[PDB]
Each structure stands twice: as structure tokens, then as C-alpha cells.
């Protein structure tokens, strides 16, 4: 149908040059910029101090990094935010820092930067330390495209707090640490069930910003899986997605800690706490499988009129996903 042999060869040295004038402008010391529109004022914050002063001065101010969510909100939900602050320039919100307990990402880091960094970690570290990292990567695999991942920030996903976020279930199940700051305040908290009190809300004060997110190394006797529904039929509900974690007592199959966190089963990310609390000290076997499946069926039960429908399929997935986790853990154990 065509003849490849006649194609013009590629010449990587002949590509459109990076604008030299732009290059010269890189020396210019970064400073706060102000843009004013018909409706919106945008401040481009250059320093963290600036961001925090701006946030104290205008707590109603709206952060924007990648705009992949705010843009949708403004266009399709007719929401208007008269004051927006863009912190993408701030070094602290872009810093990738290795530590004793895990890998820290500034809240502005693009999902592609997270993905690159984690792929590097996984290829280099022992499997037993990369369980949570591989979970994150599995969620990032068939997630949007290269265009969205290059601009969508890690912090933006977390704080958007969509019921169907593929990341928040993994961060909840792994107690990923969030460092949150305002003018004055600084606090790090592990993400748990209380971080998402209601629909599209997080446990932040109006003046706080998420600074950084530390995704933990996994320990000995610790295993992790993440799964997701490969169908989505509604804007922000009823797509099942999860992070699952188990810690055993040393060298054993006896449960010390267990976390099953789910998106798409409520109006926020939730933990099957009742169910998992009852498996502590239990052994990883058919009886635990039955009991977790019974607890999941009950705790995550959906009324016939639940928003998003697919009532049977969704219950089935919560159980079928745990089944995959159960078998994977047995394979990692035995």
C-alpha cells in the first residue's frame, strides 16, 4: 500500500532550534506576576513565602497548576474563581526528595515526573521495598494520555478529591504522608479515612496548601495491590478503583495490618475499616477470604437507587479485586 524505502530519513540535528531569546531570558530572576481579566485575576507566585502570604491575604484564592480540573470546572460547571494563584514555579512544590521512609514529591510535580521517578525506583530497588510504588504505577498505566500526564499535578489529583480518583485509594491504603502548610502552620499527616470528610472536600483549612507527598517504601512482610474498573459512564462517580495493603507479623501469614480503600463506591474515597479490623491476627486463608468478602458485601453495599447504577457489577468488582489481591499475596508469600 506504501513503500517505506522511499521515505525521507530522520535528521535529529536539523530540528527547529530552542528559541535563543528564551534561553537568554532564563537568567532573569523569577518574580511574582499579575494578570487581570474580565473576570479573573491571576497571580503567578514565585516563592513559597509569597504563596503563603497570598493565601493568608485571600483564603478564597484558587490554586491552579495543570488546570486539568479547574478548566473543566470553569467550562462545564460554570464555576468562576475571581482570584487564582499559580504556584507551579515554586521550587519546594516541585522537589523530588529521597528519604529513609519513602520518596517525596512536591505537590506541583506532574504525574509523568512521578511516573518516571517511580519507574526508576522500581528498576533499581529490591521488590520488597517497591510494593506501594508499583501500585501507583499500575494506577498510572492506562490513565489519560501523555498530554494530560505531562501537566496534571500530583497534588491536584489528591485535593480535587474525586470519588473516582485512582490515586487517592492507593495513598489512603498506604498511609502516604501529606505535608500541609499555611502562613505559620506546618503539619504532616498520613492519609486515612478522615482526610475526605464529604463530597469533593479534604481536611484542609481554607488557607492551607498541600506542599508535598511522601509515598512510602514497603517493609518486610508487606504487600500491595491496586486495581481499577476499565469502564467509566458518569462524570465523577461509580468507577471502582482501589488500593489494597497487608502487613504480616514477621515471617508469618498472620495479619498485623490490613487496608482496603475504594473509589467509586460512595461520594468519596473510603476504607473498609469494619471489615479489615476484624481480620487482625487472622491467617491468610480461605476463611479470611470468605470473611472479608462477607464484610465487603455488607459494608460497601449499595442501595438499588445508588448514584451511578451498575449496582451488581460494582459489588462484584469489590469482591473480585480482593480475590485478585488474596491470590497475589499468597503467590508473594508462598
Amino acid at each position: 500500500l506504501f513503500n517505506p524505502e522511499e521515505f525521507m530519513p530522520l535528521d535529529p540535528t536539523q530540528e527547529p532550534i530552542f528559541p535563543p531569546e528564551l534561553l537568554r531570558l532564563k537568567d532573569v530572576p523569577p518574580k511574582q506576576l499579575r494578570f487581570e481579566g474580565e473576570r479573573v485575576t491571576w497571580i503567578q507566585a514565585s516563592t513559597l513565602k509569597e504563596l503563603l502570604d497570598l493565601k493568608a491575604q485571600h483564603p478564597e484564592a484558587k490554586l491552579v497548576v495543570g488546570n486539568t480540573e479547574i478548566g473543566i470546572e470553569m467550562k462545564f460547571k460554570n464555576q468562576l474563581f475571581p482570584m487564582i494563584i499559580c504556584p507551579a514555579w515554586i521550587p519546594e512544590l516541585n522537589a523530588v526528595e529521597h528519604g529513609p521512609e519513602g520518596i517525596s514529591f512536591g505537590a506541583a510535580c506532574a504525574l509523568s515526573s512521578v511516573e518516571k521517578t517511580l519507574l526508576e525506583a522500581v528498576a533499581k530497588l529490591p521488590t520488597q521495598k517497591t510494593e506501594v510504588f508499583r501500585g501507583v504505577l499500575e494506577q498510572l498505566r492506562w490513565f489519560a494520555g501523555k498530554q494530560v500526564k505531562s501537566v496534571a499535578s500530583l497534588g491536584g489529583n489528591i485535593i480535587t478529591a474525586s470519588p473516582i480518583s485512582d490515586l487517592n485509594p492507593v495513598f489512603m491504603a498506604s498511609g502516604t504522608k501529606l505535608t500541609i502548610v499555611s502562613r505559620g502552620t506546618r503539619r504532616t499527616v498520613p492519609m486515612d479515612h478522615t482526610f475526605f470528610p464529604s463530597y469533593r472536600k479534604t481536611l484542609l483549612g481554607p488557607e492551607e496548601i498541600l506542599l508535598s507527598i511522601e509515598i512510602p517504601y514497603s517493609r518486610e512482610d508487606e504487600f500491595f495491590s491496586a486495581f481499577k474498573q476499565a469502564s467509566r459512564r458518569e462524570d465523577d462517580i461509580a468507577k471502582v478503583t482501589c488500593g489494597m495493603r497487608v502487613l504480616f507479623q514477621p515471617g508469618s501469614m498472620q495479619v498485623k495490618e490490613l487496608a482496603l480503600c475504594y473509589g467509586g463506591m460512595a461520594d468519596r474515597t473510603i476504607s473498609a475499616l469494619k471489615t479489615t479490623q476484624k481480620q487482625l491476627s487472622k491467617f491468610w486463608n480461605e476463611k479470611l477470604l470468605q470473611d472479608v468478602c462477607a464484610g465487603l458485601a455488607e459494608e460497601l453495599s449499595l442501595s438499588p437507587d445508588a448514584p451511578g447504577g451498575m449496582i451488581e457489577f460494582r459489588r462484584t468488582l469489590t469482591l473480585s479485586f480482593f480475590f485478585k489481591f488474596y491470590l497475589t499475596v499468597l503467590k508473594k508469600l508462598g
Partner: protein
Amino acid sequence: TADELVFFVNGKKVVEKNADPETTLLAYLRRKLGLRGTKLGCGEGGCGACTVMLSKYDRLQDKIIHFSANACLAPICTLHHVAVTTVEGIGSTKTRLHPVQERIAKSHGSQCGFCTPGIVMSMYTLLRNQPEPTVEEIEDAFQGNLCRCTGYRPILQGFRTFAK
């Protein structure tokens, strides 16, 4: 009391003295700069018709970086000191087509043609990052681009010639 916004498009300096924070790069390219190669397919980031390449000197990495982005969602106000490459930045029938453009055209990877610029820019960006990609990287490059006409086979087959 408002600062000037300064960015580059196809190697040329744009000095925007009255940036409205609501303005998307796609609107700017099409309706201010008159560069209509970049298309609106959805406005919500699903289709990639609006795909462009962005380049900047990253001051934290100490490096020039190139990546693809959806112009429909990129506010121009994020683009101070950023360089935009659109499909017209890389080649033209009026001069010389880029190998990316030539191969998709000649491999029958364009029917209606409305997705072709977005796909060209996804392929171009890959090659600007990895001059010698694998087949696998090539298929991955296009998770963000939809084509309703071609069934995709001929695009991948034309582009497979770039790999190894």
C-alpha cells in the same frame, strides 16, 4: 497594573500585554495568532486534537525539556517563558514536510485529517525526547489521541519505521 505575558510560538516571540487568565492556548493559537492547524475536538482533554509541544528551560533540572500538552486546557497564563510548537512549526507542503508528516500521509494514516495534526505532534514530541524509540514507546505515545476514521493500524505501521 498587569504584567506582560511573554511566550514563544514556532520560534517567534509573543508579547501579550493584556492576558486574560481565562484564555486557553488553543483559543490563542486559533483566534489571535491565526494558526488553525491545532484543532478543537472536545475541550476536555480526551481526544488530543489540540496537541502541541511545549519546551522550556527547567531551572530546577537545569535542562531544556520538551513535552506534549492539550492546548484546550493549557491557560496561556501558565506559559510565561515557554515555547510552543504547533504542527505548522515543524514542516509545510509549502517548504518541506517533517518525516513525521510525510510518513503518516504516505502510509494512509489520514482520512478525514482532523486528528492528524494532534497525532503528528504526539509523534514529534516522542522523537524530540527519544530519537530512537521502541515500538512500545511509539504505541504509548498516543494514549491521548483519538481517530474515528482509520482504525489506527496504518498510523502505527507508518510510525513503526521510526523505531529501534
